[PDB]
């Protein structure tokens, strides 16, 4: 053998998990490895599985994770660190724009996040673009299918005039029991 390349560690559907909401931590190494270990950093806590389904996010599960795998006698280097965040722990802040939310191309704007608590840190997130796929079958689902789906109904009379989107549907892929 050469050296064991480090696996990837992902949170599905994301590392930003609201309280009481499910998330999968997936450690992926190369095929046919002997053992996976998930390690929560600044703790004595671990699991010896590639896939860990967390049925409900809690404050006590938030933090830093890495995984490594074993093959014969050798251990991989660890994954890049995963920062697993519990959201919805405190009431929402306000986001505003100065001067305002419309601004000319080439100009300058500043977004202000303000909170009615003492809190000293802030993160700003920009929504990613939605990805496309009556009946939409999905066969041999994986943790990669976990997430928020919306559907549009239109008439082929006007194929670019669409409904408001459906209320969101949260699809949750629980752990394999096999």
């Amino acid at each position, epitope marked *: 053998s050469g050296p064991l390349p480090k696996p990837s560690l992902q949170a599905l559907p994301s590392s930003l998990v609201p309280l*009481e909401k499910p998330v999968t931590l997936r450690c992926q190494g190369p095929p046919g490895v002997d053992l996976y270990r*998930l390690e929560k950093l600044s*703790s*004595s*806590r*671990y699991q*010896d599985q590639a896939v860990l389904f967390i*049925p*409900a996010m809690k404050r*006590s599960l938030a933090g830093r994770y890495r995984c490594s795998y074993q093959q014969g006698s050798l251990w991989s280097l660890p994954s890049d660190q995963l920062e697993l965040v519990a959201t919805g722990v405190f009431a929402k802040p306000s986001l505003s724009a100065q001067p305002g939310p419309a601004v000319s191309s080439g100009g300058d704007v500043t977004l202000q996040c303000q909170t009615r608590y003492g809190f000293d840190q802030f993160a700003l997130y920009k929504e990613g673009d939605p990805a496309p796929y009556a009946s939409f079958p999905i066969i041999t689902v994986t943790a990669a299918h976990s997430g928020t789906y919306r559907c549009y109904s239109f008439s082929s009379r006007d194929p670019y005039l669409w409904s408001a989107p459906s209320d969101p549907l949260e699809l949750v892929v629980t752990g394999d029991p096999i």
Partner: nanobody
Amino acid sequence: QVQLQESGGGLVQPGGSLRLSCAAAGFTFDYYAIAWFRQAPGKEREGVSCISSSDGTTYYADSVKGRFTISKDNAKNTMYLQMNSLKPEDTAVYYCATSPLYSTNDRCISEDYDYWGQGTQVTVSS
């Protein structure tokens, strides 16, 4: 969301016994750390018993060793505390606790458990 459904508790004579249980739902106990904690009136929350790992090793607080048994029926999705030879100092709110993560800690600390019973009152009265 998860369930720890609580069974048992109440009023018992010194030297008597009772069984606390929690029935899981939304998960199974197979690959989960399990623990009982208690909070007596005016005292801090105390670990009473845990199995935090697949090595089988159980921890028991000095004050309950030989009287209290923690156990688990994976098929019934239930964890148990068998409490024998009850003293007045056993009077407390008892909490089942569980985690999808194992721990190497030699002792039950509350930061190692993510899912908690609301509380089961146990009162030792003469």
